[PDB]
Coordinates of C-alpha atoms and ligand atoms in Angstrom, one line a residue:
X29 CA 87.1 114.0 65.5
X30 CA 88.6 113.7 69.0
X31 CA 90.2 116.7 70.8
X32 CA 94.0 116.5 71.1
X33 CA 95.8 118.3 74.0
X34 CA 99.4 118.9 74.9
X35 CA 99.9 118.7 78.6
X36 CA 102.5 120.9 80.4
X37 CA 105.3 119.0 82.0
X38 CA 104.5 120.4 85.4
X39 CA 101.0 121.4 86.7
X40 CA 101.3 124.3 89.1
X41 CA 97.7 125.6 89.3
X42 CA 98.1 128.8 87.1
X43 CA 95.3 130.0 85.0
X44 CA 96.5 128.1 82.0
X45 CA 96.5 124.9 83.9
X46 CA 92.9 125.6 85.3
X47 CA 91.7 126.4 81.8
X48 CA 93.2 123.1 80.5
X49 CA 91.4 121.2 83.2
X50 CA 88.1 122.8 82.2
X51 CA 88.8 121.7 78.6
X52 CA 89.6 118.1 79.6
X53 CA 86.4 117.8 81.5
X54 CA 84.4 119.3 78.7
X55 CA 85.9 116.8 76.3
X56 CA 85.1 113.9 78.5
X57 CA 81.6 115.2 79.0
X58 CA 81.0 115.7 75.3
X59 CA 83.0 112.7 73.7
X60 CA 83.9 110.4 76.6
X61 CA 87.6 110.6 75.6
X62 CA 90.4 112.8 74.3
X63 CA 93.9 112.4 73.0
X64 CA 97.1 113.8 74.5
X65 CA 100.1 114.5 72.3
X66 CA 103.2 112.4 73.0
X67 CA 106.7 113.9 72.9
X68 CA 109.7 112.0 71.4
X69 CA 110.5 110.1 74.7
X70 CA 106.9 109.2 75.4
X71 CA 106.5 107.9 71.8
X72 CA 109.9 106.0 71.9
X73 CA 108.9 104.2 75.1
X74 CA 105.5 103.3 73.7
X75 CA 107.0 101.8 70.7
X76 CA 109.6 99.9 72.5
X77 CA 106.8 98.3 74.7
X78 CA 104.8 97.5 71.5
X79 CA 107.9 95.9 70.1
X80 CA 108.6 93.8 73.2
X81 CA 105.0 92.7 73.3
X82 CA 105.1 91.5 69.6
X83 CA 108.3 89.4 70.5
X84 CA 106.8 87.9 73.5
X85 CA 103.6 86.8 71.7
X86 CA 105.7 85.0 69.2
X87 CA 107.0 82.7 71.9
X88 CA 105.4 79.2 72.5
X89 CA 102.1 79.1 74.3
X90 CA 103.5 76.8 77.0
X91 CA 106.2 79.4 77.8
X92 CA 103.7 82.3 77.8
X93 CA 101.3 80.3 80.0
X94 CA 104.1 79.7 82.4
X95 CA 104.4 83.4 83.2
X96 CA 101.7 83.3 85.8
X97 CA 101.5 83.8 89.6
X98 CA 99.2 82.5 92.3
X99 CA 99.8 85.7 94.3
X100 CA 99.4 88.4 91.8
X101 CA 97.1 88.7 88.7
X102 CA 100.3 89.9 86.7
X103 CA 101.3 87.8 83.8
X104 CA 99.8 86.0 80.8
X105 CA 96.2 85.6 79.8
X106 CA 95.6 83.2 76.8
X107 CA 93.2 84.1 73.9
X108 CA 89.7 82.9 75.2
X109 CA 90.7 82.9 78.9
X110 CA 89.3 86.1 80.1
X111 CA 85.6 86.5 80.6
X112 CA 83.5 89.7 80.0
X113 CA 79.8 89.6 80.7
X114 CA 79.9 85.7 80.6
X115 CA 81.6 85.5 77.2
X116 CA 85.3 84.8 76.4
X117 CA 87.4 87.7 75.2
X118 CA 90.1 86.9 72.5
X119 CA 93.2 89.0 72.9
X120 CA 96.2 87.4 74.6
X121 CA 97.3 89.7 77.4
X122 CA 100.3 90.4 79.7
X123 CA 99.0 92.1 82.8
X124 CA 101.7 94.3 84.7
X125 CA 100.7 95.1 88.3
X126 CA 102.8 96.5 91.2
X127 CA 105.9 94.4 91.1
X128 CA 106.3 93.1 94.8
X129 CA 108.6 90.4 95.8
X130 CA 108.1 87.9 98.5
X131 CA 110.3 90.2 100.6
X132 CA 107.5 92.8 100.7
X133 CA 105.6 92.9 103.9
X134 CA 102.3 93.0 102.0
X135 CA 103.1 89.8 100.2
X136 CA 104.4 88.1 103.4
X137 CA 101.0 89.1 105.0
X138 CA 99.1 87.4 102.2
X139 CA 97.3 90.5 100.9
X140 CA 95.2 89.6 97.8
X141 CA 96.7 90.3 94.4
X142 CA 100.2 91.3 95.8
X143 CA 103.1 89.6 94.4
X144 CA 105.9 89.6 91.8
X145 CA 105.3 90.1 88.0
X146 CA 106.3 86.9 86.2
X147 CA 108.3 88.8 83.5
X148 CA 109.1 86.8 80.4
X149 CA 112.6 88.3 80.3
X150 CA 114.4 91.3 81.8
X151 CA 114.3 93.3 78.5
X152 CA 110.5 93.0 78.6
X153 CA 110.6 94.1 82.2
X154 CA 112.7 97.2 81.5
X155 CA 110.6 98.2 78.6
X156 CA 107.3 98.0 80.5
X157 CA 108.6 99.6 83.7
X158 CA 110.1 102.5 81.8
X159 CA 106.9 103.0 79.7
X160 CA 104.7 102.7 83.0
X161 CA 106.8 105.3 84.8
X162 CA 106.2 107.7 81.9
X163 CA 102.5 106.8 81.8
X164 CA 102.4 107.6 85.4
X165 CA 103.8 111.0 85.1
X166 CA 101.0 111.8 82.6
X167 CA 98.5 110.3 84.9
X168 CA 99.5 112.6 87.7
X169 CA 99.3 115.6 85.4
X170 CA 95.9 114.7 84.3
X171 CA 94.7 114.2 87.9
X172 CA 95.9 117.6 88.9
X173 CA 94.4 119.2 85.9
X174 CA 91.0 117.4 86.6
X175 CA 91.1 118.6 90.2
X176 CA 91.7 122.2 89.0
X177 CA 88.9 122.0 86.4
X178 CA 86.4 121.1 89.2
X179 CA 87.7 124.0 91.5
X180 CA 89.1 121.4 93.9
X181 CA 92.4 121.5 95.7
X182 CA 95.1 120.5 93.2
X183 CA 96.0 117.4 95.1
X184 CA 92.6 116.1 95.6
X185 CA 93.1 113.0 93.4
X186 CA 96.9 112.6 93.7
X187 CA 96.4 112.3 97.5
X188 CA 94.8 108.9 96.7
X189 CA 97.5 107.7 94.3
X190 CA 100.6 107.7 96.4
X191 CA 102.0 104.2 95.8
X192 CA 98.9 103.8 93.6
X193 CA 97.9 100.4 92.2
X194 CA 98.8 101.3 88.7
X195 CA 98.7 98.6 86.2
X196 CA 98.7 97.9 82.5
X197 CA 97.3 95.4 80.1
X198 CA 99.6 94.7 77.1
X199 CA 97.2 93.2 74.5
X200 CA 97.4 91.4 71.2
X201 CA 94.3 90.9 69.4
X202 CA 94.3 88.1 66.7
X203 CA 92.9 88.7 63.2
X204 CA 89.3 87.6 62.9
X205 CA 89.3 83.9 61.8
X206 CA 85.7 82.8 62.7
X207 CA 82.3 84.4 62.4
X208 CA 82.8 86.1 65.9
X209 CA 84.0 89.7 65.6
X210 CA 84.1 90.2 69.4
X211 CA 87.5 91.1 70.7
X212 CA 86.5 92.3 74.1
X213 CA 83.0 92.9 75.1
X214 CA 81.6 96.3 76.3
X215 CA 82.9 97.2 79.8
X216 CA 84.3 100.0 81.9
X217 CA 87.6 100.0 83.7
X218 CA 88.0 100.4 87.4
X219 CA 90.2 103.2 88.5
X220 CA 90.8 106.9 88.0
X221 CA 92.0 107.1 84.4
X222 CA 92.8 104.9 81.5
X223 CA 95.7 106.0 79.2
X224 CA 95.9 103.9 76.1
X225 CA 98.1 103.4 73.1
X226 CA 97.4 101.4 69.9
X227 CA 99.1 100.5 66.7
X228 CA 97.8 101.3 63.2
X229 CA 95.3 98.4 62.9
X230 CA 92.1 99.8 64.6
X231 CA 89.4 98.2 66.6
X232 CA 88.6 100.3 69.8
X233 CA 85.1 101.8 70.1
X234 CA 84.0 104.0 73.0
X235 CA 80.5 105.2 74.0
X236 CA 80.2 109.0 74.7
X237 CA 77.8 110.4 77.3
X238 CA 74.2 110.1 76.2
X239 CA 71.8 112.5 77.7
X240 CA 69.3 110.7 80.0
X241 CA 70.9 107.4 79.7
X242 CA 71.4 105.4 83.0
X243 CA 74.9 104.3 83.7
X244 CA 75.5 101.3 86.0
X245 CA 77.8 101.8 88.8
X246 CA 80.3 99.0 88.1
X247 CA 81.6 99.2 91.7
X248 CA 78.4 97.7 93.0
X249 CA 77.9 93.9 92.6
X250 CA 74.3 94.5 91.4
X251 CA 75.3 97.0 88.7
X252 CA 78.0 95.5 86.6
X253 CA 78.7 97.6 83.5
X254 CA 80.1 94.5 81.6
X255 CA 78.1 93.9 78.4
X256 CA 75.9 97.0 78.8
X257 CA 75.0 98.9 75.6
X258 CA 77.0 96.3 73.6
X259 CA 74.8 96.3 70.5
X260 CA 73.1 99.9 70.9
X261 CA 74.5 103.0 69.3
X262 CA 76.3 105.2 69.8
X263 CA 79.7 103.7 69.5
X264 CA 82.6 106.1 68.4
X265 CA 85.5 104.4 66.6
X266 CA 88.9 105.5 68.0
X267 CA 90.7 106.2 64.7
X268 CA 94.5 105.1 65.0
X269 CA 96.5 108.2 65.0
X270 CA 100.3 108.4 65.4
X271 CA 101.7 110.3 68.2
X272 CA 98.9 110.3 70.7
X273 CA 97.7 108.5 73.8
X274 CA 93.9 108.3 74.5
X275 CA 92.5 109.1 78.0
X276 CA 89.1 108.3 79.5
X277 CA 87.8 108.0 83.0
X278 CA 87.4 104.8 85.0
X279 CA 84.9 103.9 87.7
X280 CA 86.5 105.8 90.6
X281 CA 86.1 109.1 88.7
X282 CA 82.5 108.3 88.0
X283 CA 81.8 107.7 91.6
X284 CA 83.9 110.5 93.0
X285 CA 82.2 113.1 90.7
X286 CA 78.7 111.8 91.2
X287 CA 78.5 111.0 87.5
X288 CA 79.6 114.5 86.3
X289 CA 82.3 112.3 84.6
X290 CA 81.3 108.8 83.5
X291 CA 83.5 105.7 83.3
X292 CA 83.7 105.5 79.6
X293 CA 82.2 102.1 78.1
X294 CA 84.3 100.7 75.5
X295 CA 84.8 97.4 73.4
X296 CA 87.2 96.0 70.8
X297 CA 86.4 94.4 67.5
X298 CA 88.8 92.0 65.8
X299 CA 90.1 93.3 62.6
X300 CA 91.6 91.6 59.4
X301 CA 95.1 91.9 60.9
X302 CA 96.4 91.3 64.5
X303 CA 96.3 94.4 66.7
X304 CA 98.6 95.5 69.4
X305 CA 97.5 97.9 72.1
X306 CA 98.4 98.9 75.6
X307 CA 96.0 100.1 78.2
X308 CA 97.3 101.7 81.4
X309 CA 95.3 102.2 84.6
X310 CA 96.2 105.1 86.9
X311 CA 94.6 103.9 90.2
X312 CA 94.3 104.8 93.7
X313 CA 96.4 103.1 96.3
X314 CA 95.1 99.6 97.1
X315 CA 94.2 100.8 100.5
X316 CA 92.5 104.1 99.5
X317 CA 88.8 104.6 99.8
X318 CA 87.2 106.8 97.2
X319 CA 84.5 109.2 98.4
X320 CA 81.9 111.5 96.7
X321 CA 83.5 114.9 96.2
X322 CA 80.3 117.0 95.8
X323 CA 78.3 115.3 98.5
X324 CA 80.2 115.4 101.8
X325 CA 77.2 114.0 103.8
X326 CA 77.1 111.0 101.6
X327 CA 78.4 107.7 103.4
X328 CA 79.2 105.7 100.3
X329 CA 82.8 104.9 99.8
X330 CA 84.7 102.5 97.4
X331 CA 87.7 100.7 98.8
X332 CA 89.7 100.7 95.7
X333 CA 91.7 97.4 96.4
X334 CA 88.5 95.6 97.2
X335 CA 87.0 96.8 93.7
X336 CA 90.2 95.7 91.9
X337 CA 90.1 92.3 93.6
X338 CA 86.4 91.7 92.9
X339 CA 86.9 92.6 89.3
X340 CA 89.9 90.4 88.7
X341 CA 88.1 87.5 90.3
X342 CA 85.3 87.9 88.0
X343 CA 87.6 88.2 85.0
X344 CA 89.5 85.1 85.8
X345 CA 87.4 82.7 87.7
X346 CA 89.6 79.6 87.2
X347 CA 93.1 81.3 87.3
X348 CA 95.4 79.9 89.9
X349 CA 95.4 83.5 91.4
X350 CA 91.7 83.3 92.0
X351 CA 91.8 79.7 93.3
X352 CA 94.4 80.8 95.9
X353 CA 92.3 83.7 97.0
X354 CA 89.4 81.4 97.5
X355 CA 91.5 78.6 99.2
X356 CA 93.2 80.9 101.6
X357 CA 90.1 83.1 102.0
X358 CA 92.3 86.1 101.1
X359 CA 89.1 88.3 100.8
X360 CA 88.8 87.9 104.5
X361 CA 92.4 89.2 104.9
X362 CA 91.3 92.2 102.8
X363 CA 88.6 93.0 105.4
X364 CA 91.2 92.6 108.2
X365 CA 93.9 94.8 106.4
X366 CA 91.1 97.6 106.3
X367 CA 91.6 97.9 110.0
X368 CA 95.1 96.4 111.0
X369 CA 97.4 97.3 108.1
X370 CA 101.0 98.5 109.0
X371 CA 101.9 100.2 105.7
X372 CA 100.8 103.8 106.8
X373 CA 99.3 104.3 103.3
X374 CA 96.2 105.5 105.2
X375 CA 95.4 106.4 108.8
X376 CA 97.4 107.9 111.5
Ligands
GGB14 N1 90.3 93.9 83.0 C1 89.9 95.0 82.3 N2 90.3 96.3 82.9 N3 89.2 95.0 81.0 O1 88.9 93.7 80.5 C2 87.7 93.6 80.0 C3 86.6 93.8 81.1 C4 86.7 92.6 82.1 N4 86.7 91.2 81.6 C5 85.5 92.8 83.1 O2 84.6 91.9 83.0 O3 85.2 93.9 83.7
AKG15 O1 92.5 97.4 73.0 C1 92.3 98.6 73.5 O2 92.6 99.6 72.8 C2 91.7 98.8 74.9 C3 91.7 97.5 75.7 C4 91.0 97.7 77.0 O3 90.1 98.5 77.2 C5 91.2 96.7 78.2 O4 92.0 95.9 77.9 O5 90.5 97.0 79.2
MN16 MN1 89.2 98.4 79.2

């Protein structure tokens, strides 16, 4: 039985906010996840996004597959196209990253992963953008509360999320039709927070913290978390519950907290019916470097955009986006922009 919290609309640092942050941390440390109650507008926007997803997925495959870009990873992923731990995953997905036109300087400069969302239509665009703006408000509340719970300055995490690389995976899992029940293999997500919504069908499992269990640092190429613990208990079923979003930490929170919080491993099983879900990623700015909060002498850093780019290249080795990154050596640009960017997102 997960804990469910109502968040205040604004987080100011009062005693109630600090107390709530303590409780959020404790729930992550015990269960790996908690639920936040949605209000009528949060719920309406969730349901409108789910409905737009259902209508898009009914479109012909050739049309859905045309919603792709060789500049951004935004757009369609066919069932069986994504790889997790060397094995295909079976949802169809529409990924929404920051929507930047070719008029944006970062796109003109050829920054990896920067480009315009290949929206299927302008009603889908509006529904997803409205939903993601509401999700972002919740992400910022959660980050202020988490800072307060760790006795950190309230803006510790939000200072990294200005123009943050927030993105969302809009998912449809097919019903199980073969002997394979794997929807998505075990993995961890990459940023600060994951805020997710699901329909009534069910299929998400999460792994709580386990005393003494070593957790891979998925930001390191030699410690991918993909596939880890896939067939080992414990796995907690996330029971579909009306009127909530779930929240769990991503890789950046594990790193910054030195493992006081863990990036929650999770996986999806196919069910007897198709299943719609949306997973939202509240992320640092592409140019931000995460750092250990509790070890100021530690020199390790995570360049968030580098982590995102590495992850999406491993997910989609043959996608046109990945091919163009390799063909234009855009990973080298990524090293260049670390030192010669003009955006002012970081540095003097
Ligand atoms: N893309 C995200 N956030 N999740 O998808 C599943 C994990 C991904 N294929 C991986 O190998 O990490
Ligand atoms: O299907 C879900 O509920 C979550 C999916 C997920 O974790 C992801 O797409 O990364
Ligand atoms: Mn995930």
